[PDB]
Amino acid sequence: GHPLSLVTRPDLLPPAIDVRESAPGTSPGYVFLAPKTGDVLQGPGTLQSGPMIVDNEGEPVWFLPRGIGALNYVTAFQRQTYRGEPVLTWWEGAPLPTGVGVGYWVVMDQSYREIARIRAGKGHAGADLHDMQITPDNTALVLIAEPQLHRVDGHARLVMNNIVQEIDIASGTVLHEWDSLRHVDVDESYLSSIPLLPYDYVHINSMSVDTDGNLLLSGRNTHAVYKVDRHSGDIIWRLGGKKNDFTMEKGASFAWQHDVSREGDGTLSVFDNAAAGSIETGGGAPPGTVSRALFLSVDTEARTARVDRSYTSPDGLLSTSQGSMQLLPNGNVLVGWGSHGYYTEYADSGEVLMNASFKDPLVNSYRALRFPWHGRPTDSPAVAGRAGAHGMTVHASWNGATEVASWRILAGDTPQSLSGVKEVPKDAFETSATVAHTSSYVAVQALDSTGRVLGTSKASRVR
């Protein structure tokens, strides 16, 4: 059971989260999630989906119920930077039965207003859902996944081509385009053939910029990371896979991986699912295999790779798809367990600091990522007053507000004769408070930690 019931916001039913552990040293800031449920037919009836920012207790801070099952599927929510400003980004669109999506990426500023929409170049239906990254030059790496007739074993075969476009965000112009079928051979795939589906031979699911400005592309179904020349498109090297360029130390190989990036300590992070579904692979996976969040010491001059350090779930999870990892500024590591609706923050030493899961066991998030966030909502707090036997309860919330520390409660016989009766700390998304004297109207003011008024609700008739 996940639905959170809110007196002030009957329209918001955010999924509940169970935080089973929260030692001190957990990082500040917020966890960014896009809760979803896979069922096309029943999804909308069991879950309100959309981007969600929660605190270290699992309480929502902002929730935008934008997702509609598989009608408007929302995923891959995070914070990025555009023109030096913090922005929110996610994908919304149509998930297709072939395993890819057709949609676009929303860009929203700190006041929760849409400032741009990042689309695949014209001549394509839209962009796939597995990643989009805003580069230091304010261009977007976008992925297009489309079926294409290709010669596979002398006999033509429908294959899922992956095209990576670099898009100037302000203008929408395509600056660069990289076509996987022109560079990566279909026989590099580990994927078992699934009858009557396009052969999803590479399945790019992460695109990022390395320190030299070239691209790093994670190919799930080739088990490989491609470094690609930013300008020529030539493959610079292959890490992993059937044409591996690197000498791998014991334990450094990954499989069916996600979320690859260059990290500030010089390592390359790889979420190593270590397994996929039974059909897409040969059959089941070896008993006892688990997923790991992996930091690789990759020496590209010597073409060697070894494990610097890794982190596994305290719950023994094997995630057959999705997932994420993030190195945080204090040295902590946050891991989202993908197909499993869990996320875990560790100290560098590997000690579990925070472990959480969706209360509903069918809900998960593609990624779970932590960022500072300062919301600047442009609406007002919502309020509600409920008369009781010997008093009344006042409820207050302000979706998107991050700086509310306290609530001042106002009450009076008329909207124009409200007076301050009480101040209480904020202790939830929606905070409740009881007051002895029941009045006819109420309002609330949100106060920051210095006591300054951030916003005021409308007057609300008690009920």
> How many whole angstroms separate alpha carbon 28 and alpha carbon 15?
22
In sequence order, the 6+-apart residues with CB closer than 8 A to the CB of 96 are 102
Phi-psi region of 400 (alpha: psi -120 to 50; beta: other; left: phi over 0): left
Distance CA 156, CA 154 (A): 7
Question: Quick one: 180 or 261, whose CB is closer to Mg ion?
Answer: 261
Give dist(CA 81, CA 395) in Å, integer.
35
CB of 76 to Mg ion, least distance (A): 12
Query: Which residues in this chain contact Mg ion in the complex, by CB under 5 A?
Result: 259, 261, 326
**CB of 295 vs Mg ion, minimal distance in Å:** 11
Q: Which is nearer to Mg ion, 19 or 270 (CB)?
A: 270
3-class secondary structure, 262:
strand
- Other Cβ atoms within 10 Å of 231 Cβ, number: 11
Extract the tokens encoding 355. 């472990």
Residue 219 CB, shortest distance to Mg ion, in Å, is 16
- For residue 402, the minimal CB distance to Mg ion (Å) is 23
Q: How far is the CB of 326 from Mg ion (least distance, A)?
A: 5
Cα-based distances in Å from 85 to 79, 111, 127, 138 = 10, 12, 24, 11
C-beta closer to Mg ion: residue 70 or 87: 87
Residue among 39 and 229 whose Cβ is closer to Mg ion:
229
Per 3-state DSSP, what percentage of the chain is helix, strand, and coil (rounded to 5)? Answer: 5, 45, 50
Number of alpha helices (DSSP H) and beta strands (DSSP E) in the chain? 1, 34
Q: Which is nearer to Mg ion, 19 or 216 (CB)?
A: 216
Whole-number minimum distance, CB 198 to Mg ion, in Å?
A: 28
Tell me how far apart the alpha carbons of residues 342 and 335 are, in angstroms, rounded to a whole number.
9
Tokens of 138: 């304010």
Find the helix or strand (DSSP H, E) in which 43 lies: helix 43-46
Q: Smallest distance from the beta carbon of 121 to Mg ion, in angstroms?
A: 26
- Of the pair 181, 236, the CB lying nearest Mg ion is at 236
Task: Find the residue with minimal CB distance to Mg ion.
Answer: 259
Q: Which two tokens stand for residue 362?
A: 């069918």
Q: Quick one: 239 or 444, whose CB is closer to Mg ion?
A: 239
Toward Mg ion, which CB reaches closer, 259 or 430? 259
Element at 20 (helix H, strand E):
strand 17-22
Q: Cβ of residue 245: shortest distance to Mg ion, in angstroms?
A: 6
Provide the minimum distance between the beta carbon of 261 and Mg ion in the complex, in angstroms, as a whole number: 5
Q: Among residues 335 and 384, whose Cβ is nearest to Mg ion? A: 335
Separation between Cα atoms, residue 3 and residue 24, nearest integer Å? 28
Cross-strand bridge partners of residue 232 = none
